[PDB]
Amino acid sequence: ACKMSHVRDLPPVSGSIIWAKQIDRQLTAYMKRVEDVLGKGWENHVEGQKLKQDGDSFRMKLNTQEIFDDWARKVQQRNLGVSGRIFTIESTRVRGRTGNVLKLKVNFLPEIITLSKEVRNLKWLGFRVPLAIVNKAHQANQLYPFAISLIESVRTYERTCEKVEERNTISLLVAGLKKEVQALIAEGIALVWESYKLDPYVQRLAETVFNFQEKVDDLLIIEEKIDLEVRSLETCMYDHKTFSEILNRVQKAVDDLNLHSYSNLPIWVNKLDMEIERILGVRLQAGLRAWTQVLLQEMFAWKMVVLSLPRIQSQRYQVGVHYELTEEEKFYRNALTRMPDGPVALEESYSAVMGIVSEVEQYVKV
C-alpha cells in the first residue's frame, strides 16, 4: 500500500502510520459490529473491554501521537532535508565518475519515506511536527519536484552513463557535452549569492540529469558507433569503396560531431579519423585476402614473366591510417568552411594507381 503511495506521490511512512490508524479503526469497527450484535443499551459488557484490549494490544501506536511524536522527533533531529532538498540547484552534490561525469542532481528517493512523512505531517492536516518540517516545506516549495525528478533522471543518467562508459573515448567525447552542461550550470551559479535564481538552477539540475541520460545515449551512439563502423567489415570490401566509405564516414563524423554541443576539434577529429582508420584497416585485411584472390626471334618474354604480376593491386599501403589515403591531390579554393575533407583525391588517385598496377602487372612485356 505504501508502494502504491510511492507509485502515486503520497505519504509513504505517514501513510503507513495512518494505515495503522485505519486498520485499528477497523478493529474498533469490529467492536462496533459486536455492539451491533447487541441492542443499544448496556447489555454488552462481557468481553467488549477485552476486544478493545486486543485491538489496542497489537496496535499500541497506530492512531496515537506516538507516530506523530516519532515524526516530530525525526524532523527535529534531521528530517528536514529529505522533504526539503533545496540543495539540488547549485549546492553540495557529489557528482562524477571515471571520466568526470558531473552534474547537478539529488537522491531524494532514498529518504523519500521520511520526506513523505514530514511533508504529510506538515501539510496534510498539520500533525505533530516541529519547525524543521516547516523548513522542509519551504525548501519543498523551492525545489521539491525538481529534486524528485532529479533523482529519477540521475538514476537514468547513471544507467545510460554505464553504456557510455563502456568505451573510454566516449567519455572523452562526452566531456565536450559535459562542458556545455557545466557552462549552463556556471551561468546559473555565476552570480555571487543570487537570492532570486534558485528555481532556475533546480529546473536546470533536473533537465541536466535528464540531459546527462539523453546525452549519454547520444554521445555513446556517436563515439561507440564510430568504433562500431571501425570494427564493422563483414558487408562489402576489396575495392576502393571500403576506404572511400571510411573517408566519407570521417567527413560525416566530423560534421555530425560538430552538430552536437562542443567547441574543440579533438574529440570530433579523433572519432572521425579513428572510425576511418580502423574501418579501412579491417576492410583492408579482408580486402587484402580477396585482393590476392582477384588482383594479385620474338620469344624472350620470360624476363618480364619472372615477376610479371606480383603486385597488381599494391596501391593501398598508407601506413594503416594516413588520414588522406589517395595517391594524388585534389584542386584548391580561396575561403570557405570545409575542414573535414580527409582524402578528396580518393576517387581517382589510388584508382589510377591500382589500375596502372594491374595493367603493367598483366602486361609487363607488351
Partner: peptide
C-alpha cells in the same frame, strides 16, 4: 566539464 566547471568553481569560491 573542465573549463566551465573551473569557471563555476572560481565564481563560487
Amino acid at each position: 566539464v573542465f573549463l566551465m566547471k573551473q569557471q563555476s568553481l572560481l565564481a563560487k569560491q
